[PDB]
Design an enzyme around this catalytic site. Sequence first.
Site, mmCIF file in Angstrom:
data_model
loop_
_atom_site.group_PDB
_atom_site.id
_atom_site.type_symbol
_atom_site.label_atom_id
_atom_site.label_comp_id
_atom_site.label_asym_id
_atom_site.label_seq_id
_atom_site.Cartn_x
_atom_site.Cartn_y
_atom_site.Cartn_z
ATOM 1 N N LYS A 29 76.288 46.434 38.690
ATOM 2 C CA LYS A 29 76.288 47.860 38.564
ATOM 3 C C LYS A 29 77.375 47.916 37.408
ATOM 4 C CE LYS A 29 77.148 52.251 40.778
ATOM 5 N NZ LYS A 29 78.093 52.646 39.424
ATOM 6 N N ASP A 31 79.072 50.245 34.069
ATOM 7 C CA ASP A 31 79.328 51.271 33.235
ATOM 8 C C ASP A 31 78.730 51.096 31.728
ATOM 9 O OD1 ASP A 31 79.702 53.027 35.393
ATOM 10 O OD2 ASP A 31 81.936 52.546 35.646
ATOM 11 N N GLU A 161 81.808 46.269 38.883
ATOM 12 C CA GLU A 161 82.064 47.431 39.592
ATOM 13 C C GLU A 161 81.400 47.538 40.885
ATOM 14 O OE1 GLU A 161 82.363 52.096 38.380
ATOM 15 O OE2 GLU A 161 80.188 51.286 38.442
#
Length: 299
Positions: A29, A31, A161
């Site tokens: 995950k 960004d 993350e």
Amino acid sequence: FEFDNLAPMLATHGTVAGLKASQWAFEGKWDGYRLLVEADHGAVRLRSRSGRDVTAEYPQLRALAEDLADHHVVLDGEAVVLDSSGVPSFSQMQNRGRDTRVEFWAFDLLYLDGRALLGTRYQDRRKLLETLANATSLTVPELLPGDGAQAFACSRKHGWEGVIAKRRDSRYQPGRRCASWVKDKHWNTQEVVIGGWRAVGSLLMGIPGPGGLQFAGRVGTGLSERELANLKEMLAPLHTDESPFDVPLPARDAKGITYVKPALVAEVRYSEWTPEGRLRQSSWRGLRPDKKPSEVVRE
Ligand SMILES: [Cl-]
Ligand SMILES: [Cl-]
Ligand SMILES: [Mg+2]
Ligand SMILES: [Zn+2]
Ligand SMILES: [Zn+2]
């Protein structure tokens, strides 16, 4: 199959510990900007998550489409700008200049050389995506090994993350937030009401509910013995004669307690919730004086 009808499939906020590899694939995950990419035999078209045509914003993704020029594909993935630890970063993307390198991390294949794949299960779409990755220079980040917890720990070790867990039997549902995609971040944030402190070593957190505060655990990580003395000073004006909790506190937590009026909101960092409504691995992120206990809610 209309590429300008497509919008990204979306993940459900949830927990991945306890999920089984035999049913779930575990992806990191990151960004960045979510992007649908059409690479049609050398030509490229790009859609943002909101369906805008952002082709011209990423001229450098033309190289990707040329590399894939044997093929007509539709890809789902993340446009990403890495930090100096090699991890995708939101502020690096936000601060992007004309020359900053943007990578495209692919994680789904929606169409391949005449064949539409929305009705095909993840396991099978993923196998095709890997084939592309092995035959061309498409970047397809690898899946995380193990069951939920192990995959989560791997993600952590990459500096990532969190994890998106996707059901191996699941189809692609454009534009829909689905229970077959579960996203889980190592670190999360929660507002809490302070109901007391304890011998000073820690503070007592709660969530407003029927009949008072629902006890959320204790917090005294993210701070030292000097800072703790300060909180004791600041909080004294608020001693009370009623417990703010709906229900007697557990015995361990009741020992050496001073209740305060449930007047103050704090922000805390934490890993996950416990089955009994507690916050694991709490750390202090400060009082939030302008926030109302009455609007504190399990986020
Ligand atoms: Cl999402
Ligand atoms: Cl904040
Ligand atoms: Mg059309
Ligand atoms: Zn994020
Ligand atoms: Zn905040």
